[PDB]
């Protein structure tokens, strides 16, 4: 079983990793094009 | 190969319809519509008319 607080923390973890790897891919593509 | 079998209504009506089945399969029972009863009833194979 699990709890509401840890579910919310996991969702925020997914959100922040989405942002982080979005920035990673953006910088990778910028270097590619440059 | 298949055989033609006369499926007869279990509803007591003398309603028969011919169907086909494998010669090597067990005797065949279906739920077929009986116009005399106006309802789907059980039909059981009775005889083999011919082998097709």
């Amino acid at each position: 079983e699990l709890t509401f607080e840890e579910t919310e923390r996991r969702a925020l973890l997914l959100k922040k990793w989405s942002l982080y790897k979005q920035q990673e891919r953006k910088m990778e593509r910028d270097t590619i094009r440059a | 190969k298949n055989i033609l079998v006369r499926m007869v209504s279990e509803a007591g009506t003398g309603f028969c319809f011919n169907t086909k089945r494998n010669r090597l399969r067990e005797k065949l029972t279906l739920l077929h519509y009986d116009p005399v009863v106006k309802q789907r009833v059980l039909f059981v194979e009775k005889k083999k008319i011919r082998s097709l």
Binding site: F4, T7, E8, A11 | -
Partner: protein, 324 residues
């Protein structure tokens, strides 16, 4: 013979030897989107449609969205798929912001403009809240084309349009019993002093809707005109006949349609009472008559036809004996 195409043939520009390099629709969804867009686009060949056819606001909205995002509970419910929306607040905001446009779309679909104004359109900028008082307790609202029975519409409705000289008109669009291109006027309150409606001039007293039995669904429109400057206006059915197009042609300079609200009514027992007592007439009863079935010209020798062929053409089913 090969006549050249009369225009750009489809799939012509893209066609090139680099098929492998070209990206492809990997999804039926994207293919369907493109196909629908192409179908909407006009074409030179025969087609189905031919035959059957500010900154402050942005800043405030962005701040509100940021506040909603910051509110953790909102995100909690959104990710737990349990959040809801205030329907009443959404409805009010829709009325304030984008309600007039959707109401205009509804009127165009129902054909109010093509009938009331012969095609001329107008955005109902001013919301119009009309409701027929049901009992002494409740009241049926008339939003746009909804259904209100003549029993409910027996007594005149309450109108609350928020503004600060107006003319309100109830027009039945398809209830005319003698003229296809004609209207019925039910009540016309002119020179209304703002929000309050009881002080308006009763040009024509209120007459409840009377859609004839078996005559189908009838549509009734509340037209509200803002009156730039006050102007003078000019149970018998001959005088209850009306032409809103001509009326607005006469009063166009001083009138501007700013509110609209309509509803649909079908026959009821109150219609029978309206016809017999108020109008003092025999109520007309209409029936939907489909065209007679088509049969080919009877042949002397109906080759290969079933025995029912003769029955298809006999008129009387009872036996007949001729001279005998």
């Amino acid at each position: 013979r090969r006549t050249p195409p009369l225009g750009p043939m489809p799939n012509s520009d893209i066609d090139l030897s680099n098929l492998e390099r070209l990206e492809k629709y990997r999804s039926f969804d994207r293919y369907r989107r493109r196909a629908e867009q192409e179908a909407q686009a006009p074409h030179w060949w025969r087609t189905y449609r031919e035959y059957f056819g500010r900154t402050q606001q942005l800043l405030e909205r962005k701040q509100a969205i940021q506040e909603l995002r910051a509110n953790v509970e909102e995100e909690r419910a959104a990710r737990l798929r349990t959040a809801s929306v205030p329907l009443d607040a959404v409805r009010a905001e829709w009325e304030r912001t984008c309600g007039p446009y959707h109401k205009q779309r509804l009127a165009e679909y129902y054909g109010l403009y093509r009938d009331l104004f012969h095609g001329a359109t107008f955005v109902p900028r001013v919301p119009l809240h009309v409701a027929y008082a049901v009992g002494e307790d409740d009241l049926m609202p008339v939003y746009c084309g909804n259904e209100v029975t003549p029993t409910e519409a027996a007594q005149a409705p309450e109108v609350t349009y928020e503004a600060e000289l107006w003319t309100l008109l109830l027009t039945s669009l398809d209830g005319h019993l003698l003229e296809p291109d004609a209207e019925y006027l039910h009540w016309l309150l002119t020179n209304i002093p703002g929000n309050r409606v009881a002080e308006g001039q009763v040009t024509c007293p209120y007459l409840p809707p009377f859609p004839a039995r078996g005559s189908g669904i009838h549509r009734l429109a509340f037209l509200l005109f803002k009156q730039d400057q006050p102007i003078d206006f000019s149970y018998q059915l001959a005088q209850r006949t009306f032409r809103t197009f001509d009326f607005y042609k006469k009063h166009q300079e001083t009138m501007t349609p700013a509110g609209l609200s309509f509803f649909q009514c079908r026959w009821d027992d109150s219609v029978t009472y309206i016809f017999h007592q108020l109008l003092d007439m025999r109520e007309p009863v209409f029936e939907f008559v489909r065209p007679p079935p088509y049969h080919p010209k009877q042949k002397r020798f109906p080759h290969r036809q079933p025995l029912r062929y003769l029955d298809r053409y006999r008129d009387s089913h009872e036996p007949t004996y001729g001279i005998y």
